Design an enzyme around this catalytic site. Structure first.
Site, PDB file in Angstrom:
ATOM      1  N   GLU A 184       1.562  40.614   3.377  1.00 42.78           N
ATOM      2  CA  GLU A 184       1.774  39.289   3.962  1.00 42.78           C
ATOM      3  C   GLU A 184       0.727  38.919   5.012  1.00 42.78           C
ATOM      4  O   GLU A 184       0.974  39.064   6.221  1.00 42.78           O
ATOM      5  CB  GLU A 184       3.170  39.167   4.607  1.00 42.78           C
ATOM      6  CG  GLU A 184       3.371  37.808   5.297  1.00 42.78           C
ATOM      7  CD  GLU A 184       4.858  37.357   5.486  1.00 42.78           C
ATOM      8  OE1 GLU A 184       5.076  36.134   5.777  1.00 42.78           O
ATOM      9  OE2 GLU A 184       5.793  38.204   5.364  1.00 42.78           O
ATOM     10  N   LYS A 226       1.639  37.679  -0.359  1.00 44.51           N
ATOM     11  CA  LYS A 226       2.597  36.719   0.187  1.00 44.51           C
ATOM     12  C   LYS A 226       1.814  35.867   1.171  1.00 44.51           C
ATOM     13  O   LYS A 226       1.883  36.096   2.392  1.00 44.51           O
ATOM     14  CB  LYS A 226       3.803  37.411   0.836  1.00 44.51           C
ATOM     15  CG  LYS A 226       4.734  36.485   1.593  1.00 44.51           C
ATOM     16  CD  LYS A 226       6.115  37.114   1.877  1.00 44.51           C
ATOM     17  CE  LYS A 226       6.976  36.159   2.760  1.00 44.51           C
ATOM     18  NZ  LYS A 226       8.415  36.566   3.043  1.00 44.51           N
TER      19      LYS A 226
END
EC number: 4.1.2.13
Lengths: 353, 353, 353, 353
Positions: A184, A226
């Site tokens: 992420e 992500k």
């Protein structure tokens, strides 16, 4: 000196392709106990272990029309070990509905000295044993969040480089223990910057990420990315269409993510429940070529309508669960380009700083 | 946006000069519980809190001839919170004798995937809150140990980058909280390599350390470095004089360590108690210009006699104490150029793998 | 795989220690033919081959009180092959007076695309043969100039990295052919930035340079560093003493240049003839420790007084030569800390953009 | 501050699609004068301007069955300024047949000090003015060749960094002046290495190329890449099928080349004229998703028959021409997945070192 055998490699690819199977997305239900405090206090509820238990149990036991919409459910530690009312551990609830379970393993962010407000993330200490254990206990993927902000001298050389380096460490450790890393690299929408400035920074930051993952020898087909959508800052006065940010999200990723990545699971970032679904649709309809799944890993943008309708009162359960299910059906149409729609607190903007 | 104020910087700089003020050295009483066990079955003593408290008390209460030779002592975390028989806490026992108290803050090595037997170190998670407290409790400097091995395809570019980085993160977090970081990029003696090979690898490591410490905005006048001496490998067939080890080592440093570094405190390696003090002396007599302190952070090589005297028995206390004192005085004159050698515990190699 | 034998290594160290021998400096007489146009037009003279010939011949044939002040003379190509009036090639003139001769080998600067006005330098094509030839023809060191400017997003990551990379290539090629590289990472004084901002950028840039030279395997004892003094920008309204910029030049270099570098030959940068001498003195008097020669490599700040006194008229030769000699004696006192002094066009500021 | 305008970017993008439009390939008529001599004493012809003009004329005037198989042809600088017997300039001879004219702009390899037999490339000096003129004279793309070798301690981290950088400088300068750069990081077949080794090194090279092309702000939709196929080494004992070479090669690319790259035009290597067209075909039949053109930039492997037919004698012109045509048609169906093999010049290995 292989990082992984053939059979570990194919088992990570297998898990990764499940999570993002066509028309499936992820529910990010992994709020820290301190973060879920400000969600609960926004509807008057007290932050007690059983108020979190019942809320997380609300989302996991929803109708079986959610079953084909939700390939994975990222949980927080305490929650992986919590039981439903029928006595089943929460991970069995999720697996029974065809969702793979994941686990946030980062231990929050920390300041880098010498910078204007920038952070790295911590959580690598003992991460190898923890993953071993979380894998015995039902988890199959993991989430580590890094946070970058666009400002005048941000994100700096050092910031991009340390955050990319610890994402890759995290991903190396995750994969030795049979667990698929969700990577992420988040760029926040804070600031007044235009679309192109988010684009130029997203590119600069994913370039540095995929180089970091190469340097650390990690199997890109058993990972997920992500990333933020690519959006103007939240103080931008200019205005931009859903198509223009589709183009700019999709070209930034074309330019920087190798096709070997199994899927791309966007963060919602503060966008409204509905502009998140709408943008994810604009993106899967873009005529350009997109060799990886473009789907969702949403916290706030699947849960705001359900929290406002839950209110704290167990009476409202089936009311709140169908605010969550309508959102999951809506987003599973948008991750395939089939979402055509008017909503009220599904139109509230969800931006914090 | 600066990491540190001018007050924050004088404090650090003053601390680092007190430790390596001329003639002084560092006693590494650092051993973790498990690693000191291996030392104590050496002499047939069981590994108890009390034996570990007793043996440490024997080094920190050696008589006042050693006060001018010991600017600092590095305690493992447990030792910092133990008391002498007087009731006086061990940090305050050594404050009394003109020495600064260090703390080991790393948390061991962990393997790096895709690599041929290599390691990074862990210990950054919660580091800043840990250091804030060690500082209240008397510590004014820290130690953190990264380990590289010379070999087939080692030390890798990935292992050099990751180790220099993690020593830079450690060092920035120490200076924010007032603590002078010691920076130990140890290259193991293990292997058949020659002196010149080990000079290459050392040179290319310390260059990568000081680019990393520069990128992370690290205050160098308030740092020390604890590297290995440049030595043939422990299995090397060919033989090298002590002035060949002095040149190879003074030049490895003059090509890499910026003059601003306050002190270089060498690590013993597997070197005998006596070879370590002769190579340290040959180095301070090396007439090439050297703009840092060249001194010692010996652990095993200041305590071997101490330990094989004591033997685990209370009665040998003053006999042990004296053998540690005789070494501290030899090493404090090695630290000035002024040691001319003129037992068997002290010629034994102290090597391990 | 040695980059150099022992005997090449000691011959580069020998040359480097000559050039910066105690109390000696360098005359930078290497103006491009297009750059020496604007020098000549400032005194009315036409830019013809024999006006350059006579001017360069003015500087090289000066009194023998210059002999111990000038260890080296950097020339431009055309000039290495030009003869004096007595028929001696210019390099023999210089060697006869005890000066080592050098040669600018960079082919000017070029724009980096994608940046706000930044340059890299070119000149590496065929540089290996050219050095071979220049070495047969009398040259023993070389100058390559890179140019960085402080502005809001300058010097950027890419700029610092490409300029550091081509300096090191240049230095690798120079040293295979027996020629000592002068490394010139110049930061210009253009802009309104304070002292500390030049300091922070000098540091950031030398860090990247010495890492680049390590990566390319180049013998640091047979190189010279030709850095700017550390100075406020030329539009700064704040004002700073000679001592304050001495401190800031000397700490920046302490913090970043390893002692193995044989000597540091500053550029004058646009400073007046006299503030250049004064600052170089403030620096060699700084009480801090400085393990390398701190001396001068001056173009404009040894030649402005001589050009204004030459005027274009051969009659003024001995008048102009003693403006050059007084400057070389003045700077050879300043490179040893012995300069105590009032001057008029030796006080003109020499800044261009 | 952007390298390129939207007009500048569409031009480049359109040029790069014309070259690799479906079914088309690149004929590398690139050979320098000295390297083509080695080809011409192959068949007992002396190396004259006229023979070199004649042999090139034979490939560029092959009949119109080849127009749909040749999107571009790369000429050495001399060929660009020669004319057919018609009087028509060779750039305009191939413009007529629906092909774009490239130019080789590199200037050969040079050794890297301190390295075990490794090379960077030179040719950046004056590049921008060269390219501006090639563009006026008909060239719309460029070729620049970097060379890496697999071996003991090769390709080094220094050689990978320096080669990716210099290909990035080359590419930025080409796009400023309108020319699509081709980016050839060739890894030689030389050695006993297995397929998987060569897959590792290729993967780690192309990652370092595309971090460098990202850092230098390079427009990727207006680039092409000309890498090697992933192959066992030419001396490798063990044997590998063509679908093992197709997987190893499609996956090396899917892990490194961002989807935005417009085309991948493979280099032949030492591969027979026929093995090269079977491995190209096996690759386009590889069902793994591939979001770029997979086509050919063959030189030796489109001209071997051509050359051993011609033999240096005018009378064999149409016999040679036909053998180059039969190859171009085989390779243009390999470029679609549609080649089923069904002479001896064409099975000869074309390897050299």
């Amino acid at each position: 000196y292989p990082a992984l055998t053939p059979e570990q490699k194919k088992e990570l690819s297998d898990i990764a392709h499940r999570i993002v199977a066509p028309g499936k997305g992820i529910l990010a239900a992994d709020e820290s106990t301190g973060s879920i405090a400000k969600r609960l206090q926004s509807i008057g509820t007290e932050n007690t272990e059983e108020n979190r238990r019942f809320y997380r149990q609300l989302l996991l036991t929803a109708d079986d029309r959610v079953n084909p919409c939700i390939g994975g459910v990222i949980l927080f530690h305490e929650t992986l070990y919590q039981k439903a009312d029928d006595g089943r551990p929460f991970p069995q609830v999720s697996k029974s509905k065809g969702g793979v379970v994941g686990i946030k393993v980062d231990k929050g962010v920390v300041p880098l000295a010498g910078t204007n407000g920038e952070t790295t993330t911590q959580g690598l200490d003992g991460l190898s044993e923890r993953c071993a254990q979380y894998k015995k206990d039902g988890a199959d993927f993991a989430k580590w969040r890094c946070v970058l902000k666009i400002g005048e001298h941000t994100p700096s050389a050092l910031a991009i480089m340390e955050n990319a380096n610890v994402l890759a460490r995290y991903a190396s450790i995750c994969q030795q223990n049979g667990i698929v890393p969700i990577v992420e690299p988040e760029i926040l929408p804070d600031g007044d910057h235009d679309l192109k400035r988010c684009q130029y920074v997203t590119e600069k930051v994913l370039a540095a990420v995929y180089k970091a993952l190469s340097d650390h020898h990690i199997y890109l087909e058993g990972t997920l990315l992500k990333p933020n959508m690519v959006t103007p800052g939240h103080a931008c006065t200019q205005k931009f269409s859903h198509e223009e940010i589709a183009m700019a999200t999709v070209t930034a990723l074309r330019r920087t993510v190798p096709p070997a990545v199994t899927g791309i699971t966007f963060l919602s970032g503060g966008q409204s429940e509905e502009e998140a679904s709408i943008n994810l649709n604009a993106i899967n309809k873009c005529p350009l070529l997109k060799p990886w799944a473009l789907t969702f890993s949403y916290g706030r943008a699947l849960q705001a309508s359900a929290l406002k309708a839950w209110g704290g009162k167990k009476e409202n359960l089936k009311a709140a669960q169908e605010e969550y299910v309508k959102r999951a059906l809506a987003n599973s149409l948008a991750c395939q380009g089939k979402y055509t729609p008017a909503g009220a607190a599904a139109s509230e903007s969800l931006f914090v700083s």
